[PDB]
């Protein structure tokens, strides 16, 4: 589980600063 790995996970501020989030 990440911030963008499927299942994506950008729905976290510590995973949306990300480049495959914002």
């Known amino acids: 589980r ?4 499927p299942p994506k ?3 976290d501020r510590q995973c949306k600063p ?3 989030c914002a």
């Open 2 to 5: 990440d911030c963008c790995t």
């Open 9 to 11: 996970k950008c729905k």
């Open 18 to 20: 990300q480049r495959c």
